[PDB]
Amino acid sequence: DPLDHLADKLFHSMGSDGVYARTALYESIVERLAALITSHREAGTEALRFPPVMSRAQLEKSGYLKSFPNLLGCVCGLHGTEREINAAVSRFDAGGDWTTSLSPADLVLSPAACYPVYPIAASRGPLPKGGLRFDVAADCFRREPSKHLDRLQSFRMREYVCIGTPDDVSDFRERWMVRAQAIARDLGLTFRVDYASDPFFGRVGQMKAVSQKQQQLKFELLIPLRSEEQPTACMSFNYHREHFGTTWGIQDANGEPAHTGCVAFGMDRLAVAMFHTHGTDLSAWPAKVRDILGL
Amino acid sequence: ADPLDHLADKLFHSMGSDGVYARTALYESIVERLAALITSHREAGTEALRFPPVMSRAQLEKSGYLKSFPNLLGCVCGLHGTEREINAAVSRFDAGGDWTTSLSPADLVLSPAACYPVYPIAASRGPLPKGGLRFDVAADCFRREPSKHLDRLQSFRMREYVCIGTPDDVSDFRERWMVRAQAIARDLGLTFRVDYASDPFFGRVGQMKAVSQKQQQLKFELLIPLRSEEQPTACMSFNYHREHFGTTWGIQDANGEPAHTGCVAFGMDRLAVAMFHTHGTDLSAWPAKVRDILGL
Amino acid sequence: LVDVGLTSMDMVNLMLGVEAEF
Amino acid sequence: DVRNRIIKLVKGILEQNALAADVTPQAKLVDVGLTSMDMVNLMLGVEAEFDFTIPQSEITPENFQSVETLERMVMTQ
Ligand SMILES: NCC(=O)NS(=O)(=O)OC[C@H]1O[C@@H](n2cnc3c(N)ncnc32)[C@H](O)[C@@H]1O
Ligand SMILES: NCC(=O)NS(=O)(=O)OC[C@H]1O[C@@H](n2cnc3c(N)ncnc32)[C@H](O)[C@@H]1O
Ligand SMILES: [Zn+2]
Ligand SMILES: [Zn+2]
C-alpha cells in the first residue's frame, strides 16, 4: 500500500490494526493542523472538548444503531460481586476466558465528535436568531480494523457544528465548503470536493446512502493518497436537516424544529495526507506551507 | 454538597454520565497550559509518544492489570455477529428490549494508564543502552469508577515520564522527579504534601499487596487538599515497579539483567481542577507568578 | 425521483414496495 | 510461644526460596527481603499453619512489619 512507507517515521505498532502510537513528528503536525483550523473559527462559536466516551443512552436516542451498529464500540466491564470477579480472574489465570463475565456499562466510545453537542444545546431552550455554532473535538472510535494508515479504529475528529433554521445551516456549510478548499490549497494539498454518502449498514442502508447522495446531504474533501481513482475523504460537510432538532426537541427562533449541519476534519487523515504529499522532513516542506502552519 | 461542586458551572457540561464531562474553553486552556509547562521540564533524550484511548487487550492482560484492578477495567465490545444477527439485535432495541446481548468482546481495552503500551514498544528494540531509556507518554485513560466528585472521573488525561533501565537508573530518576514535581506544584501556587501510598488492589489479598507496596515504598503521591485536609486528592504519583514490566516484556538492561521501570505520572484533570479550586475561575485574578509560569 | 420529494425513509419504503410487487 | 517458632519457619522457608537472612522479632519483614508475592505467600502459610483466616482491618503494615507485631496478630484470636 502506497502509505506504508510513512509508518516508520510516524507510528509505532501497538499490537492491533488501526491503533498506533504517535511519534513527536507526527503529533507536531496534528497540533499545527489543529491550530490552523482553530484560526479559521467563525466568531460566536462555542468550543467544547469531549472525552473519548459518551452516554450510551444519548447515542441510542440519536439513531446511531439504525445507521452503523457494526461500527459501534461499547464499553463493558466486570460489574459483578467480588466472588464473580475473582472467578473471572481465576479463569484468566488458568488460561481461559474471563471476558464472559463482562457486561455493558452505560457508556460507548464516541463514533463522531458532534453527537454529545445536541443534548447540550437542547438544554438551553429556544435558539437565538442565527442559531448556535459549536467547535467540538474528540478521539473517536469505529470498529473497522485495517492495515491502511488512513483507516484507523481510533482517530481524532474536529468539527464545527451549526444549529439553527435551514438557512443558517445551509449558509454555514456553504461558507465552510469554500473555506475548507482554500485551506487544503494553502496546505499544498491536491483534492476535489464531491457528493458522498455515509456507509449505512445493511441492504436497507444501501438505499439510505443512495437517497443521501441524491439529496446531496453529504460532501467530502477527497485527497488522492493511494491512488486518484481511490482517494481518501479527509473532510466531510454534512446536512442533517431536522433529524437532531426533532430527536432532541431543539427549536429555532421561529418555533420550528431546528436544522443541524456539521463540517468534520479527520485530523489523522489530514496529517497522513500532509506527510504523504510533503514527506517526513519538515525543513524541506514548501515555504508557503511551512508559513501557513507557523513552522 | 462537595466543595468542588461549585466549579462545574464554569468548567464542565453534563454528558449524562457521572465522571464524564464536556470541557469548556476555560477549562481546556488551563489543561493545555499545564501540559506545556510539564513539557518544558522534559529531560533531553526523552522520547515523546502519544497513545490513543484504546490499547491491545492481550498487552494489558499480559501486563497483569486484571490480577490487580479487574474492577476498574473498561473493555471494548462490539456487534461481531452476522448481518442477520446484528439486524435482529437492533430490532429488539426498537421493540423495547436490549440489543447489548449481541455484544462480544473486541481485542481492545480502554487504557487504564498512559504507560502500559510503552513497555512492549521498548522491548522490541533489544537490550537497553547504558543509562536506560526515557519516554514521555500521554493518553486519555479510563477507570470504571463512577462518582459525582469533580476530582474523580471515569475518563481523564494522564501524562507520564517513564524510565526503563537498571535499578540505579530508575531510583535516580524517581528521586529527581520527586524534587521537580514539588517545584512545579510550588511554582503553580498549590498546597501539597508528598506521602507514601498504595494502589487500590482488588480483593482481600489486594490489601496485603497494598501493605507490601507501602512497606517497600514503591509509590509516592503528591496530595493536594481540595475538599478536606483529611482526604486530599492525589494529583501526581511516583511509581517504582521494580522488575515487573522488565520481566513481563523481556526487557534486558545493559548488564543483561531484567530491567527495572518506574514512572512519574501527572493527573492532568486533577491538576486543572486543583488550580481552579486554589485560584478561582477568574484567570486575571490568579497570582502573577502563576500567570507567568503558565505563560498567561 | 428526488425532485419529486422522496426522502430517505420515503425511498426505503419505496424499495420495500418494489421488492413486494414482484 | 509455639506460634513465634513456626512463624519464623515459614519466613525462613520463603526466604530460603531465594536467599538467606537472620530473623529477629524487632526486625522488619521488608528489610529481610519480603516482596509482595512473598507477603502474599507468607500470609497463606500463616493461615494454613494455624488454620484461621486473617480478618478485616487486620491486614495492615502495623500488624505486618515484624514477627513481633505478627505476634499480636495470631494472638488476638
Ligand atoms: N459528524 C461528522 C462525521 O462523523 N463525518 S464522517 O463520518 O464523514 O467522518 C468525519 C471525518 O473523520 C475522518 N475519519 C472517518 N473515519 C475514519 C477512520 N476510520 N480513520 C481515520 N479517519 C477517519 C474522515 O476524514 C472523515 O471525513
Ligand atoms: N502509570 C502511573 C499511574 O497510573 N499512577 S496512578 O494510578 O496513581 O494515577 C496517576 C494519576 O492519574 C490521576 N487519576 C487517576 N485516577 C483518576 C480519576 N479517577 N480521576 C482523575 N484523575 C485520576 C491522578 O492524578 C493520579 O495521581
Ligand atoms: Zn458531526
Ligand atoms: Zn505509569
Verify whether ligand 2 is closer than 6 Å to residue B34 (CB atom): no
Cα separation, A185 vs A171, in Å, equals 22
Q: Which SS3 state, helix, strand or coil, does residue A264 take?
A: strand
If you count them, how many residues does chain B have? 296
Cα separation, A113 vs A110, in Å, equals 7
CA A157 / ligand 1 centre spacing (Å)? 7
Q: Where are the strands (E) in A64-153, listed by range?
A: 73-77, 103-109, 132-141
- Cβ <8 Å between B216 and D30: yes
Cα separation, B140 vs B155, in Å, equals 7
Contact between B74 and A105 (Cβ < 8 Å): yes
Tell me the three cell numbers of residue A225.
493518497
Say if residue A61 is exposed, middle or buried (CB neighbours under 10 Å; 0-12, 13-18, 19+): middle
**To 5 degrees, how large is the angle CA B35–CA B40–CA B41?**
105
Look-up of cell digits 420515503:
C10
What is the experimental resolution, given in Å to one decimal place? 2.4
Residues in Cβ contact with D7 at an 8 Å cutoff, skipping those fewer than 6 apart: D46, D49, D67, D70, D74
- Residue of A109, A143, A269 to mutate, ligand 1, most atoms within 8 A of C-beta: A269
Residue B172: other Cβ atoms inside 10 A: 15
- Residue B180 Cα distances to B137, B186, B238, B243, B264, angstroms: 18, 10, 11, 24, 10
Say if residue A18 is exposed, middle or buried (CB neighbours under 10 Å; 0-12, 13-18, 19+): buried
Contact between B79 and B102 (Cβ < 8 Å): yes
Q: Taking CB atoms and an 8 Å cutoff, what residues of chain D touch B242?
A: 35
Cα separation, A295 vs B6, in Å, equals 41
Residues in Cβ contact with B194 at an 8 Å cutoff, skipping those fewer than 6 apart: B178, B182, B220, B221, B222, B223, B238
Q: Which residues pair with A160 in a beta bridge?
A: A135, A263
- A-C contacts at Cβ under 8 angstroms: 24
At position D56, the amino acid (one-letter code) is Q
Which of D29, D40, D65 has its CB closest to that of B205? D40
- Cβ <8 Å between A74 and B47: no
Instruction: Please give the order of strands across the beta sheet that includes B12-14.
Output: A192-195, A218-223, A232-241, A259-266, A154-164, A132-141, A45-49, B21-24, B12-14
Full 3-state SS string of chain B: CCCCHHHHHHHEEECCCCCCEEEEHHHHHHHHHHHHHHHHCCCCCCEEEECCCEEEHHHHHHCCHHHHCCCCCEEEEEECCCHHHHHHHHHHHHCCCCHHHHEEEEEEEECCCCCCCHHHHHHCCCCCCCCCEEEEEEEEEECCCCCCCCCCCCEEEEEEEEEEECHHHHHHHHHHHHHHHHHHHHHCCCCCEEEECCCCCCHHHHHHHHHHHHHHCCEEEEEECCCCCCCCEEEEEEEECCCHHHHHHCCECCCCCECEEEEEEEEHHHHHHHHHHHHCCCHHHCCHHHHHHCCC
Helix and strand numbers (H, E) in chain D are 5, 0
Q: Per the structure, how many domains does chain D have?
A: 1
Domain range for D66 is 1-77
Q: Chain B residue with minimal CA distance to A16?
A: B56
- Picking from B237, B51, B236, B235, the residue whose alpha carbon sits closest to that of residue B137 is B51
Look-up of cell digits 459501534:
A72
Cα separation, B16 vs A292, in Å, equals 39
Cα separation, A41 vs A35, in Å, equals 10
**DSSP-derived pairing of the beta strands A232-241 and A218-223:** antiparallel
- Cβ <8 Å between A207 and C11: yes
Q: Chain D residue with minimal CA distance to B242?
A: D35
- Cβ <8 Å between D61 and B205: no
Contact between A143 and B108 (Cβ < 8 Å): no
Which of A16, A88, A202 has its CB closest to that of B70? A88
Domain holding D7: CATH number?
Answer: 1.10.1200.10
Flag whether residue B84 sits within 8 Å of chain A, measured between CB atoms: no
Nearest ligand 1 atom, CA A153: 19
Give the CATH superfamily of A1-295.
Bira Bifunctional Protein; Domain 2 (3.30.930.10)
Cα separation, B158 vs A31, in Å, equals 18
Cα separation, A205 vs A189, in Å, equals 32
Helix and strand numbers (H, E) in chain A are 11, 12
Instruction: Please give the order of strands across the beta sheet that includes A53-55.
Output: A53-55, A103-109, A73-77, B74-79, B103-110, B54-56
Nearest ligand 2 atom, CA B222: 27
- Cβ <8 Å between D36 and B205: no
Q: Taking CB atoms and an 8 Å cutoff, what residues of chain C touch A207?
A: 8, 11-12, 15
Tell me the three cell numbers of residue B133.
531509556
Longest dimension (CA), chain D: 32
Which of D38, D40, D61 has its CB closest to that of B214? D61
**Which amino acids of A are annotated as binding site, given as ranges?**
114, 142, 144, 151-152, 159, 218, 233-236, 262, 269
Could you state, in order of their start, the residue ranges of all structural domains in chain A? 1-295
**DSSP-derived pairing of the beta strands A132-141 and A45-49:** parallel
Whether B145 has a binding-site annotation, put simply, is yes
**To 5 degrees, how large is the angle CA A105–CA A108–CA A114?**
150
Q: What is the CA radius of gyration of chain B?
A: 21
Q: Taking CB atoms and an 8 Å cutoff, what residues of chain A touch B73?
A: 77-78
- Cβ <8 Å between A207 and C2: no
- Residue B85 Cα distances to A10, A207, B95, B200, angstroms: 38, 20, 15, 40
Contact between B35 and A136 (Cβ < 8 Å): no
Cα separation, A280 vs A6, in Å, equals 8
Residues in Cβ contact with A242 at an 8 Å cutoff, skipping those fewer than 6 apart: A257, A258, A259, A260
Question: Does the domain made of B1-296 have the CATH classification 3.30.930.10?
Answer: yes
Contact between B115 and B59 (Cβ < 8 Å): no
- Picking from D14, D9, D53, D6, the residue whose alpha carbon sits closest to that of residue D35 is D14
Q: Write the residue with the smallest CA distance to atom 11 of ligand 1.
A: A266
**DSSP letter string, A31-60:** HHHHHHHHHTPPTTEEEEE--SEEEHHHHH
Contact between A219 and A239 (Cβ < 8 Å): no
Contact between D49 and D6 (Cβ < 8 Å): yes
